[PDB]
C-alpha cells in the first residue's frame, strides 16, 4: 500500500 502492505503484514505500526 505505502512501503511493505502486502497482505496483512503491515509496517506502519
Not at 2 to 13: H, N, T
Request: charged share 25%.
Amino acid at each position: 500500500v505505502a512501503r511493505g502492505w502486502g497482505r496483512k503484514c503491515p509496517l506502519f505500526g
